[model samples]
Target: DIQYNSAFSQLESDYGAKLGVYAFDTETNKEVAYRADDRFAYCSTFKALAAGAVLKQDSLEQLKQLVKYKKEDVLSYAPIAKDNVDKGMTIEEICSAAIRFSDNTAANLLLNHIGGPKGFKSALNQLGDSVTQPVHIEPELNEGIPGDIGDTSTPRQLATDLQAYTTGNILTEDKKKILIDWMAGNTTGNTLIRAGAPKSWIVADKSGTGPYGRRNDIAIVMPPNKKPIIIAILSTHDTKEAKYDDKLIAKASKIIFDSFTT
Candidate 1:
């Protein structure tokens, strides 16, 4: 029997943050968890899942169709879509922008394309998740109020949802390949869970940041012939001036990776 809850609690105290982690191997079913059931802000991590949801509703041809939006559609954090305003972007491009760049405007575009925030919640329900509760649009949804339940999910549910979308039956094989390829190429999560895994292993992940020092990383770690491991690391500092700490999430990820048995 393996347990690291006490060690994690100590990490929380030392780091001045609340940490939640849920990790497991797909083939072996080995696991490690701490505060896995606690709800924390979903942040930009929702982009990847939202992209998966988009795939659920749109065909490949529809995904390649262009969508026109004006300058007003561009949000503060949307680097990819901001510059592409004149010609518009494809549905796939928007999803890619959201996943790779964590582009806020791209997220909102997709949110409406997928039928808005309420539709997203309904989509999660159809996908077999009841714990994920997303209720707002981008930038607005980025507001991560501590102890507030809206736009929040448990680490366990987050990881499980990703696993189901990636390897389970919720998506077609081609769509699965499409989403994972986007995640594998993500430039945003290098310092979070990816930093903790072995250098040679391929890590596909998305990261999120919010007020009150909220930081999160959700990932699929592929280590050669060994089956992949899924992990979600959620953390937040309760103080007012505290800032996001990439290293704290990396350290927590390292702890969980080390806890896995071969």
Candidate 2:
């Protein structure tokens, strides 16, 4: 069992952020929850869920034609697509970029192919996750109040979804492997969940950061000889106070990781 109340209190006191966390042990089918039912701005973390929807409805060849990225499609924080916008990218490349780098342009392109917000919601419902609602594309997400309303999810819902996804209940095992591989290679949110774990620990996760002081990391951690653990940490605060959110996420992740590993 993990005692997270102290860590949660520390995060609130130090960063003035609202935080929620959910940790589950796959081997025992046990869960530890803190504000797990409370919703928070989803930011780019929703990209993973979007990817799920796209993969579920379309084949790789179909998606390749649907999500071709052009220069005109470039949006904020799209490191891969922005530079090669003239060259364009395939659907596989775009989805990989969306997860690996959290590319905003790539996310919206995939969203369009999957029928946008409604399609994502439908996919989530089909996957047994009715609590998450993705209503907007990038740049409009996590802007607080009216803007922040675009996407929302709770830690418990996301954790449950991840568990289902990893267990081969959501997509074909091969497709699930593709998605997990992309997430494992993610280069963003290094200071959040990944920062707190030992270098040898295997982590497959997606992270989200926004101008509205939102920082989130949702992942599956697999330690040698132990069944994987699913963890989702969601947080929000004043934009000016955003600087500390990542550190808070890291601290919280460390707490969870140590509880299992030690």
Candidate 3:
């Protein structure tokens, strides 16, 4: 079993850990964590939700045709390539690019394909998030869009949804597999939660960066048969230091991951 108390304390000291961690295994119905109920911004993490919603409406082939580039769908620069290409791609390609490459344009394209801002809002409402509700249309598409819904959620809730999806209850088993595969394709090199684990440890995660005072990461870590681990970190620091916040998050996450097993 993982050491919750020691892990949490080390994470706090190392990363300024204002984080939420939760894990559940359906086979054994096991759980672990410290204050996993706190709420924080969902960031680009919502793209996964958006892709799921679109899959509910359209087939993968249909998504391919619908996933074209539009001027209205640009969010962040990092997730998407900074070179700014306007190649019109299919939903499968776009969704893969969205999660795997963390492409902002691809995310916007998928959101548009699914019905734009209003569609995302409706989906969030159906999910029943009272505290971490979707307050804006685009969390990253910051410009002339409908503004932010300020979506927030506790670590437990995020983990619950993730677990549900993973267990083949929330979405179809095939779709759930697609989602997990996309998450596994996440290519950001920051290494926030999995910082100290074995080089081959598997993790599925979504990360976010907000204005000046926010940074968050939500990940599902699987280490052999020792029950999965969910790590959610939400933080706020001075705007001056905000530019480098992801680094701080990485530092803290490394401390947390290193404290537990090898």
Candidate 4:
């Protein structure tokens, strides 16, 4: 809706929402793209990548250290951080809540912890990413106003980012371990890509939601004794409050999962 020079845009023409899917097969170096270049806002989904920026810039010592934010600091959609205000949570705990629970307060805190979106953008630049950028922090940026690029990423860029840090060289082994562990156990991701994948295949993934009916998920899908598939599917309807349809994303996941051979 915002801009549309995407490849294979008609692959799922009847799906209603504009689709941006880019799934890569590592062993074969294959890519399944549909509007992979199209722009889409990053909602709660940016937390995992935001966590990586902090992990990249800060040592494990800092992340494991304790920090506190009051109830007043909590924002809407926070399922975890709402309870830890007084007792406080570790930087690691806060990150975990942000990624695993998609906690809004934790997302903003990490942005602040990393010195805001400019700092986050620098981390992305270090990894050779020139496309994805976050201009504002939580709730503020998630507004998803039409034509605004406040916090946006392409499916291709998101998938590649995951691959680089997960299997590539952007972060240290321990750093990679911390991020992967969080996504593998993410309380919010099961119904999308994972639902389409086989039980035998382990998917370490993150799901994002924003305005305009955005429903997105990115993952490193590991099938037994086979090369892993890196997938990112970003979708958004052309309205401000386009109640997200998780099923369409799940359906897209199944289509991609079934397409991968070896």
Which candidate has the highest TM-score of all?
A: 1
Clashes of 4: 0
C-alpha lDDT of all candidate models, in order? 0.88, 0.78, 0.60, 0.80
lDDT for model 4, please.
0.80
Model 3 misplaced regions, further than 4 Å: 1-17, 25-28, 71-87, 127-130, 138-149, 225-228, 238-262
TM-score of each: 0.96, 0.90, 0.74, 0.92
Q: Residues 73-149, candidate 2, lDDT per residue (tens digit)?
A: 78867888787666667777878888899888888877877788788888888887878877777777656572344
Ranking by TM-score: 1, 4, 2, 3
Clashing pairs in 1: none
lDDT of 1 by residue, 93-192 (tens): 9999998989999999999898998998999999889999998998878685677788999999999999988888989999999988889956688899
User: What does candidate 3's lDDT look like per residue over 66-127, in tens digits?
Assistant: 43444555554535533344665767777787777667777767777777767766765565
Please estimate how well model 1 matches the true structure, expressed as its whole-model Cα lDDT.
Answer: 0.88
Measured on C-alpha atoms, candidate 2 has an lDDT of 0.78
Cα lDDT of model 4 by residue, 138-161, tens digit: 678777676777688888898888
Off by more than 4 A, model 4: 1-12
Clash count per candidate:
0, 0, 11, 0
